[PDB]
Design a protein around this nucleic acid. Structure first.
Ligand SMILES: [Zn+2]
Ligand SMILES: [Zn+2]
Ligand SMILES: [Zn+2]
Lengths: 68, 49, 92, 107, 75, 124, 101, 45, 184, 74, 119, 186
RNA sequence: AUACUUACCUUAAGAUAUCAGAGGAAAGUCCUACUGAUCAAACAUGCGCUUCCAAUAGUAGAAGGACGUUAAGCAUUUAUCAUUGAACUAGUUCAUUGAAGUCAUUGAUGCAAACUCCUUGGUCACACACACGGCGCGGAAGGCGUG
RNA sequence: AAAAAAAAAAGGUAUGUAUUAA
């Protein structure tokens, strides 16, 4: 019976992919922290749409879904 | 009585409203009968004196 | 605000709608809320491409409304009085 | 109450977080009915939570059916039935007569 | 804040247009302040009435954001 | 044409004929009367002007004459969500002095109403 | 805990925490350390810049902005660059913001 | 001139006919007491 | 908040959809508001345009051409007269507002489909609405099923002959004095 | 009356599988087992697969945002 | 903190408000509402030309631009000049402020200090 | 209008007549189903981070933040305030302005007027019992009276009686001022 | 308007320019028809400040409209899908069955003109005066400045 | 050596019933 917010609290500092709603782009990286709006911070992220990205901030409105 | 109260009131409460209305009318008839009996008793008390 | 209060003042009168989808619903306004979502009665509908139909009852979401056309005689309605004198409010 | 997301969070918290109360398979409780009317006043005991209500109403399908809730629910309800009957008695005492029969004695 | 007033609509078979293209018809069950509307015996209307129409599920819920207009075909 | 006061906000301007731009590329021209927190406003006599898809190629860069199809809709109430920008077309039927006059007379009449109501309620 | 229960100062401590400890700490640490950031908008072109200020809504004030936008028609591409000294960016357009090494 | 309804303990005039009484029958007090009586009958069985 | 109803000028405290809906539907508020728009509507007809006059200098030519033209006499009624004639004219306009000639409905009264069309309660387009338009009727017919089988012969001492066409009161002396034939 | 999020809670505990349509722009529909939800109608789906619009790839336990939700259908 | 309170101190400055349409507005700036509603005075607002061998520009922004009444007939390119445009807040994308003003003086918010000075 | 489903009678309802139906104009915009913002946003590339170096070599050093130094000034100032409070906190058996006899009999007067006198305070304090010692707090930099004093009395019970009587009601009136009273507290 | 009966319901919070200095009840707060600076509003008041305000020495003209006519103007492009049978080239016509189907084809799109009619203005005063680009009285709309 | 109680309806809108003149 897990809800979304404890699900993000359980996914901290685990490898998580996040699919944005636009190009079917997903950022694969270790989650750092989340806001109350589910803003995302990531370390060692990689952009799949192939690249490697050091640190990332993702705004809440553009994400489609979050997976592990 | 149905056509008069059916317009404004919702149809789902129309049945229970109707039953409550009939019950109220019956109670009114009962009160009328009781008043009539009291009147008869008063007439008898006036005739005895 | 006054713009919504004028929509509440238009209840029971023929009004026109434009939804942001492009359609046009002209007919009589039954209900309206402060969220601007209204429901209309015995309304003629114009699809975005012009096909016109008729439906007896409709409910539309206020967020999708674009403009609402209201009977003109509501222009001089008391909502638009700038300097107006209200009495004292009752104490409760 | 100020925004719909707040009200909706309140409703979802009512859905997801002995307490007895509401009991019988149909609605009831003494308190929930009369809110806003002059008769009943404010906070009422325990908690009529939709989670417990869904559990119990689903146990109606489970059919475990142990009317201990109803045996507490008679102690709750019949007292209010008696209160209403008493208020009826008081009103019957009040209404019928006044200075009244004075003039009627006059008659 | 305020609940939308569908109170006369519920239990009546209703057609409502999802987004721009789609039109769903079903018997309205419940609704909320966001106008999220849950209905049963849903059917997705299309050009060919018996043919391209396909039922969705026993219970379907709709986000109020995708609701445009809601018409009841019923009393 | 018309010079708007160098500092004038949407509240300063009433009864001016405005020109309202929406997200869809159509315009509502008419007298503004009220508005609101989220900037949905009420126009008195307004006409929506539209550039057809066929005339649009005439606006792309090369005296141009555009046929702008427009329809008249009186006393509307716009929605703040659709509004994009607002421009001033004309100035009101009345001057500033005359509007001061009618404002003062309207206020005096309003006070007279409160007195006539108060003393009609008090004695009876 | 919902926001409508808290007092006026508890919101200030909450925003101070969210900026200091939270996702937007990526931008905050970028403002203090003078590290240039890359920002992708939803308009589909990307600014390489340096953040002088930021805010809750993510709208932020920038200095030495370099905008990069490409366009293609029928698979004919051209890359265009536009330089700006100082800028103010409304936060609803942005999607991803990364902190350069 | 009225008769007190056993259900809601409130007064009902005979001359106001039915269509006015419907407002009293659909109110929260009267409808609630209507349900509570039925619940007593439920619990007597 | 509190909802001030400016038509009635009376406040109602802590606005709610129920109480506000009840007040707006209320009979007193109804009369007050309807009368209000009756006044605000009669004003635009009552108000005189009073458009501004722009007087130019008459030229030497048209003063000479207009001087040879004789001066026409003007008629001006007395105050007591003009008050009465204004009353009459206004009451005549109010008459032309309400006329709405229905004679077609009188012609077809015995038609086989008269009950489905002109009764307007039992119609399709307007039929269902009239039911919800019926007043709450607080305190104190022509069904559609009719057929031609009733009233088979439309004339058996039943009908009244068609009402004569009206005439203007002013010009009523214009009528030909005598009819061509002898009516009973 | 059956409030909609009550119905969703009946999708959580009854463990019925659901198909859910997204916005018309994306072009995929998700299906899985709805576990829990928030006030914003953003839901966690266990054993979810993304179908383009039946060869879709399996996702996982995935949090899906409520902004893109159109239908939740059993 | 609300960074919009910064824009309210930028009053009476030359600015470009670059909107979501791609439409750009050069003008002198007047009072900015708390919702970022931006009201300007003497403005020249236009559309950029994507070159790319005739790539059709925004079709809605051309119509919205001709419908301001400020586009003059003899303009060869696509521009309009007018006085007093009022812009809704959610339409703004970027704002390019002049190079001359210093941020260190304007970026100090008096409420931020006031909270710290009082504690 | 014919039906006019309304509160108003027929004459008022026919007064609200709407304008004629709106004429149909074909839409010049994109249908709602086709409406979207720009898709296929190119993400931040390894090629973009490769183009970063052109920006980095051009603007290697960012402009200093002088609006943050206004905050770093006040916070460091607060830390220094805490350090001065630390200088005060380390400094009552040494003080010997406070070395007078047993603290149980020490009664503290405060809010006394700066123009007050030792005789009047000897009378007002002498009202509740005999006075053992008396000391008036004056600044160390100069003799101006601080407005507080310590009065040692022969018995602690009389000192408590003085605290309750004099200090518990309105403050004890002395000269033109109301003077609070309590225990030594130190 | 008064009295009685019944129904429906009840308080988002806070604040009213900022900055600085002096004073009253080491830290902070509150306060001073206290002192300065800046800002804002109202009211006055000025600028050789800027723009605009129609013929009568004539039957005109300027701005804006017509949801006006010529006008079936001229030039273009359009009028449903599926199933079965017959003929047919190797797609076409006719008949039957089903589905939906804004009206229009005198339409719709583009092009242009002529005519007619509506609303508006100081239709003010002095002047019919050979200059190198003023300094009549007002009204409308602004900008700037002082109090 | 110690001791003992509390002060209160509010008032808005709507519906029905009765009264306010030859
Ligand atoms: Zn309870
Ligand atoms: Zn009852
Ligand atoms: Zn009212």
């Amino acid at each position: 019976p897990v809800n979304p917010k404890p699900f993000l609290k359980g996914l901290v500092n685990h490898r998580v992919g996040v699919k944005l709603k636009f190009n079917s782009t997903e950022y694969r990286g270790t989650l750092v922290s989340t806001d109350n709006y589910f803003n995302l911070q990531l370390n060692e992220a990689e952009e799949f749409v192939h690249g490697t990205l050091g640190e990332i901030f993702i705004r809440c409105n553009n994400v489609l879904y979050i997976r592990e | 009585a149905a056509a008069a109260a059916a317009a404004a009131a919702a149809a789902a409460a129309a049945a229970a409203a109707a039953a409550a209305a009939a019950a109220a009318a019956a109670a009114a008839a009962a009160a009328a009968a009781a008043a009539a009996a009291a009147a008869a008793a008063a007439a008898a008390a006036a005739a005895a004196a | 605000g006054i713009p919504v209060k004028l929509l509440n003042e238009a209840q029971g009168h023929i009004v026109s709608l434009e939804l942001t989808t492009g359609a046009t619903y002209r007919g009589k306004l039954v209900e309206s809320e402060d969220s601007m979502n209204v429901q209309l009665r015995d309304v003629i509908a114009t699809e975005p491409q012009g096909a016109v139909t008729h439906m007896d009852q409709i409910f539309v979401r206020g967020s999708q409304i674009k403009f609402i056309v209201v009977p003109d005689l509501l222009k001089n309605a008391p909502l638009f009085k700038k300097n107006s004198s209200r009495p004292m409010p009752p104490i409760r | 109450m100020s925004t719909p997301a707040a009200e909706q969070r309140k409703l979802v918290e009512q859905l997801m977080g002995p307490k007895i109360c509401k009991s019988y398979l149909v609605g009831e409780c003494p308190y929930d009915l009369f809110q806003g009317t002059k008769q009943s006043l404010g906070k009422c005991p325990q908690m009529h939570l939709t989670k417990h209500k869904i559990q119990y109403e689903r146990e109606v399908k489970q059919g475990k059916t142990f009317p201990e809730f109803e045996r507490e629910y008679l102690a709750i309800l019949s007292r209010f039935v008696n209160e209403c009957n008493g208020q009826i008695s008081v009103a019957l005492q009040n209404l019928k007569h006044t200075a009244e029969e004075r003039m009627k004695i006059q008659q | 804040v305020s609940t939308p007033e569908l109170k006369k609509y519920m239990d009546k078979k209703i057609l409502l247009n999802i987004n721009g293209s789609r039109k769903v018809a079903g018997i309205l069950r419940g609704y909320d302040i966001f106008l999220n509307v849950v209905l049963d015996d849903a059917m997705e209307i299309n050009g060919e009435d018996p043919a391209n129409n396909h039922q969705l599920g026993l219970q379907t819920v709709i986000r109020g954001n995708s609701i445009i207009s809601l018409e009841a075909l019923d009393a | 044409k018309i010079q708007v006061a160098h500092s004038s906000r949407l509240a300063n301007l009433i009864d001016y004929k405005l020109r309202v731009l929406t997200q869809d590329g159509r315009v509502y021209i008419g007298q503004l009367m009220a508005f609101d927190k989220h900037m949905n406003l009420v126009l008195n006599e307004c006409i929506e002007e539209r550039v057809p898809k066929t005339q649009l190629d005439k606006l792309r860069p090369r005296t141009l004459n555009i046929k702008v199809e427009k329809r008249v809709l009186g006393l509307t109430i716009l929605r703040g969500e659709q509004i994009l920008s607002t421009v001033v077309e004309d100035k009101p039927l009345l001057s500033k002095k005359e509007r001061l006059v009618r404002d003062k007379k309207e206020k005096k009449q309003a006070q007279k109403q409160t007195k006539l109501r108060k003393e009609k309620e008090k004695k009876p | 805990r919902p926001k409508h229960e808290l007092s006026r100062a508890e919101l200030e401590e909450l925003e101070e925490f969210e900026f200091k400890h939270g996702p937007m700490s990526l931008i905050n640490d970028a403002m203090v350390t003078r590290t240039p950031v890359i920002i992708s908008l939803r308009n589909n072109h990307k600014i390489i810049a340096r953040v002088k200020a930021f805010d809750r809504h993510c709208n932020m004030v920038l200095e030495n902005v370099k905008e990069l936008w490409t366009e293609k028609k029928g698979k004919n591409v051209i890359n265009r660059e536009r330089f700006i000294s100082k800028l103010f960016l409304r936060g609803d357009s942005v999607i991803v913001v990364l902190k350069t090494p | 001139k009225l008769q007190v309804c056993e259900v809601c303990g409130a007064y009902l005039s005979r001359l106001d006919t039915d269509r006015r009484l419907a407002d009293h029958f659909l109110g929260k007090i009267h409808l609630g007491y209507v349900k509570m009586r039925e619940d007593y009958d439920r619990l007597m069985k | 908040t509190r909802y001030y109803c400016e038509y009635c000028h009376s406040y109602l405290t802590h606005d709610t959809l129920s109480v506000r809906k009840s007040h707006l539907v209320g009979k007193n508020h109804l009369r007050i508001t309807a009368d209000y728009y009756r006044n605000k509507a009669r004003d635009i007809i009552n108000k005189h345009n009073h458009k501004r006059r722009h007087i130019g200098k008459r030229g030497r030519k048209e003063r000479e051409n207009s001087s040879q033209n004789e001066t026409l006499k003007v008629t001006c009624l007395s105050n007591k007269e003009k008050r009465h004639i204004m009353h009459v004219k206004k009451m005549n306009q109010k008459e032309l507002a309400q006329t709405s000639i229905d004679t077609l409905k009188l012609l077809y009264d015995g038609s086989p489909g008269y009950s489905k069309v002109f009764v307007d309660a039992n119609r399709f387009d307007i039929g269902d609405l009239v039911k919800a338009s019926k007043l709450p009727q607080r305190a104190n017919s022509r069904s559609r099923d009719e057929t031609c089988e009733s009233n088979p012969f439309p004339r058996l001492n039943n009908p009244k002959k068609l009402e004569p066409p009206k005439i203007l009161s002013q010009w009523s002396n214009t009528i030909p004095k005598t009819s061509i034939f002898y009516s009973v | 009356m059956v409030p909609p999020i009550n119905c969703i809670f009946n999708f959580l505990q009854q463990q019925t599988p659901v198909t859910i349509w997204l916005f018309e722009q994306i072009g995929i529909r998700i299906k899985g087992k709805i576990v829990g939800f928030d006030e914003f109608m953003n839901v966690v789906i266990d054993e979810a697969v993304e179908i383009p619009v039946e060869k879709g790839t399996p996702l996982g336990k995935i949090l899906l945002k409520g902004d893109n939700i159109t239908l939740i259908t059993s | 903190m609300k960074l919009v309170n910064f824009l309210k101190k930028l009053r009476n400055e030359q600015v470009t408000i670059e909107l979501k349409n791609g439409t750009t507005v050069w003008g002198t700036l007047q009072s900015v509402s708390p919702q970022m509603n931006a009201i300007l005075t003497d403005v020249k607002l236009t559309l950029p030309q994507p070159r790319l061998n005739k790539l059709n520009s925004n079709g809605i922004a051309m119509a919205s631009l001709y419908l301001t009444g400020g586009q003059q007939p003899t303009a060869s390119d696509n521009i309009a000049s007018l006085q007093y445009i009022n812009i809704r807040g959610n339409t703004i994308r970027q704002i390019i402020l002049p190079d001359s003003l210093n941020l260190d003086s304007l970026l100090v918010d008096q409420k931020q200090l006031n909270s710290l000075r009082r504690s | 209008m014919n039906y006019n489903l309304s509160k108003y009678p027929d004459d008022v309802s026919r007064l609200f007549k709407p304008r004629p139906p709106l004429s149909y104009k074909r839409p010049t915009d994109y249908p709602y189903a086709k409406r979207q913002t720009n898709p296929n946003i190119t993400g931040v590339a390894n090629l973009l981070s490769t183009s970063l170096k052109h920006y980095m070599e051009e603007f290697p050093e960012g402009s200093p933040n002088n609006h943050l130094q206004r905050y770093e000034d006040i916070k460091l100032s607060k830390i220094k305030n805490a350090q001065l409070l630390d200088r005060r906190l380390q400094n009552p058996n040494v003080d010997p302005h406070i070395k007078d006899t047993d603290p149980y009999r020490t009664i503290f007067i405060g809010r006394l007027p700066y123009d007050l006198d030792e005789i009047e305070l000897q009378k007002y304090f002498v009202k509740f019992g005999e006075i053992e010692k008396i000391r008036i707090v004056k600044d160390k930099i100069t003799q101006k009276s601080k407005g507080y004093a310590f009065i040692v009395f022969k018995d602690p019970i009389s000192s408590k009686m003085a605290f309750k009587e004099i200090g518990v009601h309105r403050g004890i009136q002395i000269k033109d001022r109301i003077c609070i009273v309590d225990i030594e507290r130190g």
